[PDB]
């Protein structure tokens, strides 16, 4: 076959398409949803399991479960059928034709890439596939090739530093503070200005409140003043069944959890620091560089604000001697898979693929040395 | 001064008296009851509400209003008639003399503990009060400084894990189901054997079915093969008028609900896997302390079996690696009430008070900044 | 008087005891640790910090810091609260009265030894002191006045090749790689098998695993095909909370690191070729009496397997004309504070230490000039 798919199964919401396409062919909630309640009506197309926009859509009768926790698979009988999904029902194409590179978080399970290696070779029979890591592929989308990532999904945020094409694994930064957890920190705030959302489908419905109205706060004590100042910065949202919510500082005091982690208790440098102490782990001859392409990237990123509170807070931490110059390209939004569909596309990348006549004879344990 | 009052308004039954007794002074429905029928009997002592026992006894002609929902007050006309009953008509003292401690779940809306506040300082003119949390005060009542409190009300179930007197507010789990939702579920299942309760003075007699009949079953599918082995389950309650109604194993079906919430269709973990989801969401070296400490509370832990039924559940979820115990006092229908009457009594708590003097110059705003 | 001091105030774990002991009289961890979580059990003993073990038992609640980083002091508000634990809690002896012996790695900053001397003679006001090398005390331990000491602690790395009673300052190596780095390195690898430890609590159970599970392979890449034949090699540790984890190659492959330091991505020789390269700097006379008298020290030395894995390595690169016989005591966990021990007790060294009535005519620059 002449095209390869690429294919970001990412936490939260999964990406697909062709490589050589400059957008995602689709994307829909890396959801596998299942019935809640006493099915009644005969005579139906009633189905046991619903999965991505179906699942989504649908809702209301649902339980629903992510199969990734943490950019971990956790439960691999319903991510074969998101990946069934994926490949027989809108991209539409048979899987013995296309090669397919899929996507993985840094500092993941061994056993979580042999898996998935297994599944791709035995069960869907894929020619060839490779398993590109979700920063190195943020580089290709933004044509760089010195950088430090920030990526931030649904499951994980991720650094990995990279100078003049050479990643730098000492200084990886892995936190499990993500777009998921943001979402459940929503959900705890809102019961205190008197709103309970409590169900899986009702964590849907605050994962909208996040992405319409939220954003990151340029100075977050001087913000809390200015919403004792009350009523400027408060907000509408419109739940299904026409309801309407009133939002406050809890608006912009949700996705401050990346800046100051303790509010959802877990210790750890936030976002700002993070990625510094990650700077601050390469070798000193390349950490202005990397302070000239600090890279954004993943739904998470998307905040407005995002990029002027961190590179306040990285120019806090830096010597004032020299400047960040945070990049945050308008489509970082899906520039991991936009990254992988330059990579696959390469003429030069042919040549690294895991082929099933190298995988036969070398198992699922092939993925650890043919890959980074 | 020689006392404190301690006043938890909880749902369903406020628990009040002064603080060093070794019990509340007094016990009440928190019920506001309004005559629902045409008043013919001119020249006698009739009255426009009842409120408490006066309600609780007359309830064959009263609309019966519980003015706490789920631990939200969400009637304020009337509940400050139960204040005013509690303060002047069986504790019969003036509130102008004595500084009170409230109560409240955790997770409540704030709007709640402002106006509560606002209440107490402008309607009733006390000299200071505080609001504790009902999981806080659990732990006194028991002499631990490390435990998870289990707590179910009437209206609210919650779990609040303190290790060595520090709360870990990220980890506390609060859900809606509690003694209430047992009591209209159990009017539900009674009505598939043939008795109807309808009204809201009917609920008060399943009320007293679920509280003298009711326990929890050591195994479920095990008991339900021991009802098909028919009749040594089954007892017969005397309603008022003398009817005698048999209940079989909705005695014990009723309960359950409890370790799984889909019977209400309600979509959550029950009280085992919550107390477990709250362990499991705590720091990893502190555990196995409050799988030592676990500590139980509320009317809702009355039944008999719960202990065990709990214990069971916990141990099969928790690594079998180390012991689970589970501590249940037989006082634990007033363990909140009798907390609070430690906390008050304290010589290093005198400090914390919320003062008359400090709330009018920083409005009822000032909640906030004191209590937890 | 029947003592001095002698406290070897170390990075990780502080030594300290009466000079003439035969070993330390207390032993803990060099933590200072502060609460992170609200606080609500009022009525306690609620402490603003805890030290030591204190700190090292009640992790589970507290953020952990380490003042001391690579062998710097590098938090003295913390510092002085370790020496005042070290001198009052369990030595509990008043520092006016006893002269202290303190100890300090090869090529520290001089700013590092000025505030040390400083601060026990205007905080402690102790009669008098001296600052003794880590490594020249680990030969009067061995009983040695010839040898090549390797020291190797929780914060650095370091060999002093001494002969006949002379230093070789010109031939002095140091490295910041040390028990710290392979916790911290552990940690990373444990995370590959899925095991998600994080937390400044958390590395303290990764050091319990380093501590009680690690060994140094004898031939790496043969211990590595070793592992193919899998389930010889593991092993199994009990986490608080009574998980069980399963540990691997990364069982050995974590202490290699010393060998190996490009797996941590800094570049040096490992530890065999850091000796190697310090006694090829020594004059050539003395090189066959110090391949002899390799004396091993500090608790980075005690893996099982590591005299082996070095007496291996430093037969390969030193010349096979002869032998090296390096000397590891049982001891040696404890070797630079046993050699103060002595030091601290010789009727020759009471003419040499630095006293409070020459401190106020020089200032803590005296320090420089009556020491190494
Ligand atoms: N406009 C937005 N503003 C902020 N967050 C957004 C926005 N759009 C989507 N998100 C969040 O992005 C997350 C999904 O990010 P994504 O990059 O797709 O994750 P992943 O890389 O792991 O696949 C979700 O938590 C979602 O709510
Ligand atoms: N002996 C009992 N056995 C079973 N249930 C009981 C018992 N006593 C009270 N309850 C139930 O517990 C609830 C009252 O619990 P309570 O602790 O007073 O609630 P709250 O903490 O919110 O004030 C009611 O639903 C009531 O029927
Ligand atoms: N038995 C052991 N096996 C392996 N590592 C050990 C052992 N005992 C101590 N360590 C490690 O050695 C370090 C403490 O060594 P120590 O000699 O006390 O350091 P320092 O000289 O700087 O005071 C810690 O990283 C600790 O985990
Ligand atoms: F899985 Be996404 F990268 F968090
Ligand atoms: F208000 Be009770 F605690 F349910
Ligand atoms: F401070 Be120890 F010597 F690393
Ligand atoms: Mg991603
Ligand atoms: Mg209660
Ligand atoms: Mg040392």
Known sequence: ETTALVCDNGSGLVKAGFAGDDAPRAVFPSIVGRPRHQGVMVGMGQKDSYVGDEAQ????????????????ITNWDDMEKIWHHTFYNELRVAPEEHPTLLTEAPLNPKANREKMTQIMFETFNVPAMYVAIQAVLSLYASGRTTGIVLDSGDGVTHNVPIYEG??????????????????????????????????????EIVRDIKEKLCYV?????????????????????????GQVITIGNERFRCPETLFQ??????????????????????????????????????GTTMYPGIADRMQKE????????????????????????????????????????????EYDEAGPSIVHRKCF
């Open 166 to 203: 050479y990643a730098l694994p000492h200084a990886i930064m892995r936190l499990d503070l993500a777009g998921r957890d943001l979402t459940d920190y929503l959900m705890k705030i809102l019961t205190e200005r008197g709103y309970s959302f409590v169900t899986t489908a009702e964590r």
């Open 314 to 357: 990285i120019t806090a931490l830096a010597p004032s001697t020299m400047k960040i110059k945070i990049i945050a390209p308008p489509e970082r939004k899906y520039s991991v898979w936009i990254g992988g569909s330059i990579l696959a596309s390469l003429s030069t990348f042919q040549q690294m693929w895991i082929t099933k006549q």
């Open 261 to 298: 982690p303790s509010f959802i208790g877990m210790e750890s440098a936030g976002i700002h620091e993070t990625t510094y102490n990650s700077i601050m782990k390469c070798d000193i001859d390349i950490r202005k560089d990397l302070y000239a392409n600090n890279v954004m990237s993943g």
């Open 217 to 241: 706060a340029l100075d977050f004590e001087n913000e809390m003043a200015t919403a004792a100042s009350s009523s400027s910065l408060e907000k509408s949202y419109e739940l299904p069944d």
């Open 57 to 72: 859509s649908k809702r209301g009768i649902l339980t629903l479960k992510y199969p990734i926790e943490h950019g971990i």
